Amino acid sequence: MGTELKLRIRDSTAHCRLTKLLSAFHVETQHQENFFFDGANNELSSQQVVLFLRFYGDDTPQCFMSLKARAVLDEGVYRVDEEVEENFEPAVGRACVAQPEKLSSVECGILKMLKEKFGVLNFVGLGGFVNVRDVYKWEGLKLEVDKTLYEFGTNHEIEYETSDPEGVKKVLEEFLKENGIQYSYSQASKFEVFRSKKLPQ
Amino acid sequence: TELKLRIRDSTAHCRLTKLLSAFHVETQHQENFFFDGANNELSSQQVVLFLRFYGDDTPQCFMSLKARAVLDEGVYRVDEEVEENFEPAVGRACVAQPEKLSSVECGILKMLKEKFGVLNFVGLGGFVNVRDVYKWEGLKLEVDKTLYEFGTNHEIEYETSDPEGVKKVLEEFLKENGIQYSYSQASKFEVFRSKKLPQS
Numbered sequence: 001m002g003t004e005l006k007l008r009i010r011d012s013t014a015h016c017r018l019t020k021l022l023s024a025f026h027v028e029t030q031h032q033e034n035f036f037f038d039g040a041n042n043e044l045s046s047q048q049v050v051l052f053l054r055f056y057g058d059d060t061p062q063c064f065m066s067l068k069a070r071a072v073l074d075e076g077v078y079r080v081d082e083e084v085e086e087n088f089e090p091a092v093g094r095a096c097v098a099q100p101e102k103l104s105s106v107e108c109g110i111l112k113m114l115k116e117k118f119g120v121l122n123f124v125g126l127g128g129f130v131n132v133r134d135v136y137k138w139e140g141l142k143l144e145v146d147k148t149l150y151e152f153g154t155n156h157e158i159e160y161e162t163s164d165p166e167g168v169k170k171v172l173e174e175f176l177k178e179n180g181i182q183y184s185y186s187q188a189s190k191f192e193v194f195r196s197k198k199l200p201q
Numbered sequence: 202t203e204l205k206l207r208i209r210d211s212t213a214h215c216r217l218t219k220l221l222s223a224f225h226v227e228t229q230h231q232e233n234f235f236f237d238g239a240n241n242e243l244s245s246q247q248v249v250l251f252l253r254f255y256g257d258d259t260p261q262c263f264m265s266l267k268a269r270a271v272l273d274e275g276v277y278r279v280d281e282e283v284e285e286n287f288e289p290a291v292g293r294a295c296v297a298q299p300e301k302l303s304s305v306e307c308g309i310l311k312m313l314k315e316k317f318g319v320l321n322f323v324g325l326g327g328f329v330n331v332r333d334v335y336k337w338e339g340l341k342l343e344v345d346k347t348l349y350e351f352g353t354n355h356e357i358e359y360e361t362s363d364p365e366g367v368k369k370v371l372e373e374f375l376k377e378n379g380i381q382y383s384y385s386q387a388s389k390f391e392v393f394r395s396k397k398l399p400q401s
């Protein structure tokens with residue numbers, strides 16, 4: 001399952017420096033639109049569950065639904081117990097963004113699982129945000145850099161998935177220190193920052 | 202005065218992106234947020250008031266006022282247009298609580314108080330637009346990917362005082378190289394208020 005290293009980049013300038021350092025390894029940019037959903041009685045959030053639709057797409061526009069349950073973040077290491085994703089038809093996705101109540105009528109795996117584990121729900125939309133993700137790959141290295149465009153300001157993050165998030169943590173941190181990229185440990189998911197309506201301090 | 206072509210879909214936008222990649226000089230992730238009075242004072246005069254936030258090293262922000270924009274056969278003309286850069290933190294405060302626009306002192310707002318009186322500002326929402334800028338000598342070209350909640354729109358923009366002459370060569374260029382397009386029929390803000398993508 002998932003376990004990643006997750007660092008907040010201090011500001012725009014640190015983010016640009018980091019972008020420039022790694023430019024040679026850039027392989028993709030994703031313009032991600034995330035929209036989040038819950039039941040009318042906070043069925044999902046009271047059980048530490050996040051339900052969202054992601055639209056992304058270079059050549060072909062794509063859409064998937066993701067359910068993530070019980071995500072812990074300590075000292076920059078983030079782990080999730082449950083994570084399930086299924087691809088979703090984009091036009092249906094847009095229809096559900098316009099009117100989340102339609103989520104009750106669409107047939108798909110995640111949504112029955114959701115009816116089974118939680119009630120039949122009255123679905124509500126919680127809004128969404130754009131995240132710009134740059135993907136760096138060289139040999140056996142994924143590195144992801146995020147610029148999240150909240151209405152209330154921009155957040156920047158590094159994400160590197162490893163099952164050894166502690167050996168990797170030392171090297172990554174000293175890479176960043178040595179090269180003048182100011183950072184700290186992320187204290188909150190992108191969704192929690194969004195729900196705060198403010199950038200963390 | 203500018204040329205404004207709608208690119209047919211993402212794949213056309215992709216072909217164009219790679220066609221022109223060598224001339225790429227900039228990407229702006231623009232957040233546009235729109236404002237009016239409580240009585241649609243501005244929109245009833247064909248008047249648009251917005252804040253744009255954009256990136257790089259420095260977070261940047263400007264206020265823009267556009268009055269009386271006509272769109273004919275892919276040609277855009279704006280009758281008046283004024284821009285002044287705006288403090289980004291104040292901008293975010295006004296996005297969060299648009300009524301605070303009544304207290305900030307700046308040219309566009311003083312001008313606006315003079316044509317319309319004291320007004321109670323409301324937010325009309327906003328959207329993210331990704332602008333790629335291509336520059337080669339005296340050629341400036343902008344390609345837009347607008348990320349509305351209800352879908353993506355793709356657009357070309359060419360600033361020019363000779364829209365007829367530029368129109369012939371640009372269209373022939375796009376056809377020759379397989380980029381499907383048509384003439385934009387609506388502003389980004391008009392599409393946004395429609396809550397729907399134009400007829401494709």
Ligand SMILES: [Mg+2]
Nearest residue numbers: 149150153154
């Ligand atoms: Mg932002």
Ligand SMILES: [Mg+2]
Nearest residue numbers: 348349352353
């Ligand atoms: Mg879109």
